[PDB]
Amino acid sequence: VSLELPFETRTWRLQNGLVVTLMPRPALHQTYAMFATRYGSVDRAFRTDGQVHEMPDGIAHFLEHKMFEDPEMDVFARFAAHGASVDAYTTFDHTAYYFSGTGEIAKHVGTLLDFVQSIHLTDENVEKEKGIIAQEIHMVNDHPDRRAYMELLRAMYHEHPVRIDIAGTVESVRAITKEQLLLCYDTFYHPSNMVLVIAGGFDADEIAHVIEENQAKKSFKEPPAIERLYPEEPPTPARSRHWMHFPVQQPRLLVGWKEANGAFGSNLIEQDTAMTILLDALFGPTSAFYQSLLDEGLVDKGFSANYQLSNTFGYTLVGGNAPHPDVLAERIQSHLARVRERGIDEEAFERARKKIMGRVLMSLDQNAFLVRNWVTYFLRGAEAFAFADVIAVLQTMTLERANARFQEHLREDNMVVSAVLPS
């Protein structure tokens, strides 16, 4: 049967181009709300209003930091004084602002729209924030987990911006100007480039009227047209093998595979869902392969396999702590060589599909998951997204399709093997 959620999903588009999705769930105390923009760390270059721009790295994340500045509000206290709290993040391809709370939802939604739809930059506070971000960048270059990850990306990618960390570099952050920040904010923070998604214990009629009234009272420009400009990234890694020494107390191994290109909308949903099942079957905590590695002390319970897919890039990562990183790397390559020769085992595949169907069903209980995922798939091109779309891929996915995905993507020539070794 097609997925029937127990609650209403109300999705419409405002006069100013903003898409809104409300999921009222009256039995819950929490409301969780997210306002996000289709703009992230990888949007280095773009054309808008007839001109080509190439920015220093770091702008999406700089704007995130500065979004909370307001001469007429402590933004965090405005939420907190009325029973909610607010946070944000920047990722590769979107920036998100979100709160959760238990009452006065009308006020909080108003505050969320208001603080994201105005920016307050001065030459002074742009200078101040550069120092704060440079420091954050230095600290994060000393974090071993983040370092191993960034070494893999740097090895994998020749030119794609994903090879630079989300905050940028010290050099690039230092070159950012107020003018650039304002250009990017005006270009990407238009409501036509954004999405507002809310789930939990709120009155949908009440909140829908508050949003319309808030937006109707503001004045927006014509929507900017954006041509996204990205390089022709080679399908092979820049370096296929890397190791380095770092003050870590045990070795760490990361093996990755590079997608030749990104994906959009329903294609992205299908490929992402298919990898979730495949990686669980190959590497998951209930796989005989994982149990054999654990029994042999080659991994610990923090071992994981993850997939990341966006419009202009994608990759698989597998690994974790590895007392014998060479041995673990060999076992992974052997495992894959056998599946490559012999085909995916059907029984492991059906157990995986059933685990992931359950995991998704249970996750649809959570306001945060419902919201985050509606936002994420919408902005990545599923303009009419529905969770039934995910469930339906989980139901209809086949062993042939699992084999084709494996053959396409988990290969030797698009693979990077990288290690961090104790100093």
Q: Is 115 in the site for Na ion (CB under 5 A)?
A: yes
Pick from 19, 36, 67, 336: which binds Na ion (CB under 5 A)?
Answer: 67
Out of 361, 383, 400, 408, the only residue in the binding site for a copy of itself (CB under 8 A) is: 361
202 binds Na ion (CB under 5 A): no
Rounded least distance, CB 2 to a copy of itself, Å: 15
- Comparing CB distances to a copy of itself, the nearer of 79 and 230 is 79
If binding is defined by CB under 8 A, does position 84 make contact with a copy of itself? Answer: yes
Q: How far is the CB of 51 from Na ion (least distance, A)?
A: 25
Nearer to a copy of itself, 100 or 312 (CB): 100
Whether 213 sits among the annotated catalytic residues: the reply is no
Q: Which is nearer to a copy of itself, 106 or 156 (CB)?
A: 106
Of a copy of itself, Na ion, none, which one sits near residue 369, judging by CB under 5 to 8 A according to partner kind?
A: none
Kindly give, in sequence order, each residue whose CB lies less than 8 Å from that of residue 277, ignoring residues fewer than 6 positions away: 349, 352, 353, 356, 394, 397, 402
Output the smallest distance, CB 208 to a copy of itself, in A.
21
Partner touching 67 among a copy of itself, Na ion, none, CB below 5 to 8 Å by kind? Na ion
Q: Would you give the distance in Å from CA 391 to the centre of its chain?
A: 20
**Least distance from a copy of itself to the Cβ atom of residue 229, Å:** 35
Among a copy of itself, Na ion, none, what binds residue 53 when CB lies within 5 to 8 Å by partner kind?
A: none
Total residues binding a copy of itself (CB under 8 A): 29
* Secondary structure, 3-state, the chain: CCCCCCCCCEEEECCCCCEEEEEECCCCCCEEEEEEECCCCCCCEEEECCEEEECCCCHHHHHHHHCCCCCCCCHHHHHHCCCEEEEEEECCCCEEEEEEECCCHHHHHHHHHHHHCCCCCCHHHHHHHHHHHHHHHHHHHCCHHHHHHHHHHHHHCCCCHHHCCCCCCHHHHHHCCHHHHHHHHHHHCCHHHEEEEEEECCCHHHHHHHHHHHHHCCCCCCCCCCEEECCCCCCCCCCCEEEEEECCCCCEEEEEEECCCCCCHHHHHHHHHHHHHHHHHHHCCCCHHHHHHHHCCCCCCCCEEEEEECCCCEEEEEEEECCCHHHHHHHHHHHHHHHHHHCCCHHHHHHHHHHHHHHHHHHCCCHHHHHHHHHHHHHCCCCCCCHHHHHHHHHHCCHHHHHHHHHHHCCCCCEEEEEEEEC
Closer to a copy of itself by Cβ: residue 101 or 314: 101
Q: How far is the CB of 7 from a copy of itself (least distance, A)?
A: 7
* Residue 7 interacting partner from Na ion, a copy of itself, none (CB closer than 5 to 8 Å by kind): a copy of itself
Rounded to a whole number of angstroms, the minimum distance from the CB of residue 214 to a copy of itself is 23
Q: Does 286 bind a copy of itself (CB under 8 A)?
A: yes
Residue of 4, 64, 124, 151 with catalytic role = 64
Q: Which is nearer to Na ion, 91 or 118 (CB)?
A: 118
What spatial distance separates the first Cα and last Cα of the chain, rounded to whole Å?
Answer: 56
Q: Could you tell me the smallest distance in angstroms from the CB atom of residue 120 to Na ion?
A: 6
Does 29 bind a copy of itself (CB under 8 A)? Our answer is yes
Number of Cβ atoms within 10 Å of the Cβ of 249: 8
185 lines the binding site for Na ion (CB under 5 A): no
Stretch that binds a copy of itself, among 60-68, 191-199, 363-371, 385-393 (CB under 8 A): 363-371
Active site residue ranges: 64
Residues of this chain that interact with Na ion (CB under 5 A) are: 67, 115, 118
Residues of this chain that interact with a copy of itself (CB under 8 A) are: 6-7, 25-30, 76, 80-81, 83-84, 100-102, 142, 247, 249, 286, 351, 354-355, 358, 361-362, 364-365, 367
